[PDB]
Every structure is written in structure tokens, then in C-alpha cells.
Amino acid sequence: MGEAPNQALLRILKETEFKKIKVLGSGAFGTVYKGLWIPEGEKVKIPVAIKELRSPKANKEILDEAYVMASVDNPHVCRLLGICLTSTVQLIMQLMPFGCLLDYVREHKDNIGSQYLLNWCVQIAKGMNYLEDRRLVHRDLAARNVLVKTPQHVKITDFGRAKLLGHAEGGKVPIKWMALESILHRIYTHQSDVWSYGVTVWELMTFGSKPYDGIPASEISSILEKGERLPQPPICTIDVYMIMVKCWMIDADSRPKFRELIIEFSKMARDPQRYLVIQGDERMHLPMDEEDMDDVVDADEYLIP
Amino acid sequence: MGEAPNQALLRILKETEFKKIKVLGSGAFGTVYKGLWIPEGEKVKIPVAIKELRSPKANKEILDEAYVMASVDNPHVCRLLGICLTSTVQLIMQLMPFGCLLDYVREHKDNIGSQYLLNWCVQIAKGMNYLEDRRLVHRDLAARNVLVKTPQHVKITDFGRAKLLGHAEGGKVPIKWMALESILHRIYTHQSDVWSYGVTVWELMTFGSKPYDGIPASEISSILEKGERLPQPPICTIDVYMIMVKCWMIDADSRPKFRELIIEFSKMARDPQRYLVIQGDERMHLPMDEEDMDDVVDADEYLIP
Ligand SMILES: */C=C/C(=O)N1CCC2(CC1)CNC(=O)c1cc(-c3ccnc(-c4cccc(OC)c4)n3)[nH]c12
Ligand SMILES: */C=C/C(=O)N1CCC2(CC1)CNC(=O)c1cc(-c3ccnc(-c4cccc(OC)c4)n3)[nH]c12
């Protein structure tokens, strides 16, 4: 008995229960449709996303992704409703109508204030801390893989590279989000996800800029070994940028834990304009003792293992 | 092996880590203080409530309550941070600054709109559905035992009468919230908590009225056997009152499950003024295809066992 038994339920959903299916997009990730799941004998209509990878090799890797998603349950992690057994296997997930966070921050950069930016950092850190408690290394954390249910509520998605108990084989990888030890030695831990979280925060604070724009992926390892890092965003205070820099330390144990990031960003979220300087932050719209106030943290943001 | 092992952690917290302790109130429940928990070697201050029952018999029943609270983890259920081993044992919980929901609805009745009322019904149902998955019967669900973290966020509290695997002994009980089978035969199930949920919803919709006001507790059993129930609140539509009436059925299996109540109230929460008629509902302030819209439910409100 090395590990406890996984008693998660894999729901097999009938093809006849799905209606109004339309394509949202496609690429290397595969194909994602939007649809309407109507369970039989229940007056309920559930907006769902339906994912197909781009047959034996496709079904193996997609069912590995279904295994991980069926095993997780957290408000800031994406929910698998079930799978549909067609010729190629389909993952049925909750619909996140506003899309990925990277596209959201690019499209609404003029209406995104410091409160929303800092709240997203807290929610992403809460999702990743949950994944650490479940002993999962995500290995693909980026702004593209954070989905927006509403502007106030984001969730982590895409568990295609996810692995239990945080050495990987060779393949096609997101070099620009990876820790230096992951690029050189193929070592992946929870602390390598913290590096990726730092890069994800930098994406949001720059309003969806590409990290190391122009630089090819092969040159990134040598750039990071020389001590170069992503530059300070215009809106970021030294306080916020110091947290990103701490995520990009060479020593993995020197980096902050996700529980510490939850605490630190939630303090900043109580006084957002002290930590992010955004032009026109007041009119942004999207659809106790004084001495104590600085170091105050709510119990819901102070997470015990 | 009848039941799985409970691997929950009981944190023992030092008396020297608590500061600024002030009394909030006292009664039959015991005494509740507000305070500030400062963990040693961490720059963090956590607002906490500290509960003491009103010594061997007091320590036994309070540690039974600590056992249940240490075992639960849900956003709509109250969080135990730990216990403090003084002469009489103290439960350390998260602070809920706005107090209990019963007192909140009485104090702010002029500023409470249909959106908040229906959202509270959903959140309470989510907390109770979680407790059903954990095989806990609360046995004391009422507006007094729902605490307000913020006006947008409520949690269930007080597990002094909580019991595992849903026959009780004789004692002092909340007769006016109990199911008829619990009053007559001392039978307690998850379906007896649904009756109490119905009475809790009636408390909110009447803005904190006392149920069966004037009637003594001994006469309640005979009143319910005759078919009498709590009357329809002025603000309630027939739709909302039908859900309360369904909670008060004689047959426990005919009552709705908590997962069904989550679904039904969340549909109503999308169009609140169709289901609750409140004078001046528009200016209340507290600190897709058209054919589908009626039966639409988000995946987060469609809870699978
Ligand atoms: C913006 C990044 C992007 O385009 N990606 C990365 C995520 C992507 C799709 C390509 C690939 N991998 C996933 O795991 C995944 C899941 C989803 C997804 C799930 C649910 N809902 C949506 C969605 C997107 C846009 C609009 C709507 O509503 C109409 C819904 N997407 N996407 C991905
Ligand atoms: C309004 C009902 C009431 O007064 N009660 C019932 C709940 C009560 C106190 C008496 C007894 N049992 C409990 O389990 C419990 C827990 C709390 C509680 C926990 C955390 N914070 C508070 C609180 C109340 C009022 C104001 C503040 O902030 C200053 C905090 N209460 N209360 C109870």
C-alpha cells in the first residue's frame, strides 16, 4: 500500500442526451465544441464543452486526461461531467462562456482593473494549491489554460500533461513556461508549477503579452542560466514583481509555495491600488483596528495541509 | 470495515497565539468571543471566533463538536481552525463578522432583495448537500445557525447535535424546526434536515419571524398531525411556497433532496423577481437561446453523488 485507492466515479454519458452542438475552435489541442447536455428523466439543461483530441493513440491520452479530471473536485479547477464513447472518445466539461483568460485580458484590457487582476492570481493559486494536496503536478500552467466562467470566477484547465506524485520522457513542450530544471534535466515538481505560475501572473499583468517575444525556444535555457528574466510590467509595483522574481529562483526550495502565494495576493487584493498602478482604475466595469489591517488574512485564505 | 478511516487533523493551538479577545455574547449555547489568532513565525493575523460551552461533561460534548468540525471542509460549512486546551476546552473558528442570518434579516429587512434571499437558499442547500455526502445529519438547521461571512457568503454552523450515518435519546430539542417523525419517534435522517431547511427558508422569507409564534412546543406535534403548516409569506410566490410545503410532507421520501433544492433555487436565482415580490426590490443595496433559459442549470449547481 503505497497510495490510497481512487474511488472517483467515471460517468458514461449517452450521445442522445446532447443537443445544439456547435464548434468553438480547433488546433494542436484538438477540437472543442459547445453544446447542451439534457439528462434523461430530469428537467435540466446543462451548458457543456465537448473536447476531442486530434485513434488508438488519441483514445489512450484523452482517457488519461479523463482520469485526472474525474479525480479532482475544487471550485478553481475544471469539472469533468463525464465521457461519451463515440468512435473517438469525447470529454464532457462545464462550459466557460468567456473563454480562456489570455484572450480575455487582451480583448478587455481597457476595462480590467487591479481588483480583478489580483483576485485572479488568488483563485489560480487556490486551484494549484488544491492540485498539490492531491499530489498532481500540472506541467502546463499558463494564461491560455485558465478558463473564465465569469469575470469574477476562473478555473484551471487542460490536464493532458498532468502527472501524479511530484522524470519525464522526451516530447513537444511549453519551454517558455517551464522551470530551468525542467528544461535541462526534465525534473518536474510542485515548485516547477510555481515558476509557471509566475509566468502566468506576468502574462496577466502585461495584458496578454507573449513571454520572450521574438526569442526561439532553444535559446531560452541559456538565457535563464545567464540570470535574465521576464521584465517588470508597467502597472506592477516592486512588491508584485518581487513575487514573480521569487517564483523564478534557480533553487526550487527558495521559491514560494502556493499556500504562501494565496496569502500574499489576498493581502494585496484588500488594497489593490497600492500594488497595481493602472490608468483609469476607478471606473473599470466588467459584467477592525488600523494597525492590524496590513497583515490580516481571512481563514479561507489561510490554508492548512 | 464498516466505515472508512477519518484522517482529519486536529490542530492544538497555543493560548499565547491569541490577542485582542472580546466577548460577543452568551446564553444556553455557551459563550462566544471574538479575537485575533497570530501563528508563531508567520506574518499573518487571522480573525477568529472562540466558543466555550457552559467541566468533564462540558469538555466531552465540545470535543464531540470539534470532531465533526475538524472532519468537514466546504465553502458553505463553518471551518474549525483548531482547539485550545485551557481548563475548559475552546473551539477556534473563522470569524463571521455580520453574525447569524436570523439577526441579519431582522436588522436589514428594508435593504434585503430577492437576489440575496434566493442566493442564501442555494448556499444553505449546498452546505447541507455536502453534509449528506459526508453522512452527517445536522439535527439543528435554523436561521440562527447560518452565519454571515459577508452578505454574499453564508455558512452553516453549530454541530452540537450532529450525528453520523443518517434513533436519538431524550433531551432538550428545537421542536419547531423538527420533522413530525423526529418529534413523535425520535427518528432523524437527511430528510428530517430537509424539513428544517423548509422552516429555515420560511424564516428568511418572513424576515426573521418566529415560527408558530405564541404556540407552545408541546402542542406542535398535534398541530402538524392535523395537517396545519406554516403560512405563506407575503413576498412568496406560489412557486417558492410549494417548495416549502414539499419539505413538510409527512412521508420523508416524498420530500425533495438537497441536490434538487440547489437546482430549483438556482433556476429561481436567475430571475428572482418572478419568484419573490418585494416592495422596492430594484434599489436594494448591501455591503444563449430564449427557449432554453427556463430549465438551464450551471454544472456547479448540478451535483452528482
Ligand atoms: C485561449 C486559449 C485557447 O484557445 N486554447 C487553450 C485551451 C483549450 C482551447 C485552446 C485547449 N485545452 C483545454 O483543455 C481547453 C478547454 C477549453 C474550454 C472548455 C470549456 N469551454 C471553453 C470555451 C471557450 C470559448 C468560448 C466558450 O463559450 C462559447 C467556451 N473552452 N478550451 C481549451
Ligand atoms: C443569531 C443567533 C445566535 O445568537 N446564536 C446561535 C449561534 C451561536 C451564538 C448564539 C451559537 N452556536 C454556534 O455554533 C455559534 C457560532 C457563532 C459565531 C461564530 C463565529 N463568529 C460569530 C460572530 C457573531 C456575531 C458577531 C461577530 O463578529 C463581531 C462574530 N459567531 N455563533 C454561534
Side-chain angles (χ1 to χ4, degrees), chain A residues 24 29-30 32-34 48-51 65 69 78 93-104 143-147 157-160:
Chain A
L24 296 173
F29 61 91
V32 187
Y33 311 87
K34 77 177 185 176
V48 294
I50 302 173
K51 197 166 84 158
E65 195 178 333
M69 290 189 71
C78 270
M93 307 159 63
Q94 181 185 6
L95 195 73
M96 306 294 275
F98 298 88
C100 74
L101 193 58
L102 185 63
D103 290 10
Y104 191 83
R144 67 183 176 279
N145 298 325
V146 179
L147 305 180
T157 199
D158 203 328
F159 298 95

Side-chain angles (χ1 to χ4, degrees), chain A residues 9 20 42-43 45-47 79 94 149 155 267 289 291-292 295-300 302 305, chain B residues 9 20 36 42-43 45-47 79 94 149 155 267 289 291-292 295-300 302 305:
Chain A
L9 302 176
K20 304 192 176 191
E42 293 191 64
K43 192 166 179 167
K45 298 178 184 167
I46 302 175
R79 185 168 173 171
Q94 181 185 6
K149 182 191 168 175
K155 306 196 191 199
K267 288 178 176 186
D289 297 316
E291 67 192 338
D292 296 325
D295 301 318
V296 168
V297 182
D298 192 76
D300 292 320
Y302 187 78
Chain B
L9 302 176
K20 304 192 176 191
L36 214 66
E42 293 191 64
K43 192 166 179 167
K45 298 178 184 167
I46 302 175
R79 185 168 173 171
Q94 181 185 6
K149 182 191 168 175
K155 306 196 191 199
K267 288 178 176 186
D289 297 316
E291 67 192 338
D292 296 325
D295 301 318
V296 168
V297 182
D298 192 76
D300 292 320
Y302 187 78

Side-chain angles (χ1 to χ4, degrees), chain A residues 2-4 128-138 162-166 190 193:
Chain A
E3 188 65 284
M128 292 303 304
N129 179 250
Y130 174 79
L131 291 180
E132 180 160 15
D133 294 345
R134 305 287 288 121
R135 302 184 171 77
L136 291 166
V137 184
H138 194 278
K163 190 178 173 180
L164 195 64
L165 265 56
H190 303 299
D193 282 340

Side-chain angles (χ1 to χ4, degrees), chain A residues 270-304:
Chain A
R270 288 191 282 90
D271 194 9
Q273 306 206 339
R274 187 176 170 180
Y275 301 103
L276 294 180
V277 186
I278 296 172
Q279 293 179 234
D281 196 6
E282 301 91 59
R283 68 99 144 188
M284 300 287 188
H285 292 292
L286 296 172
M288 191 170 290
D289 297 316
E290 296 186 318
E291 67 192 338
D292 296 325
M293 275 193 181
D294 292 309
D295 301 318
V296 168
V297 182
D298 192 76
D300 292 320
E301 281 74 63
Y302 187 78
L303 286 86
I304 303 167

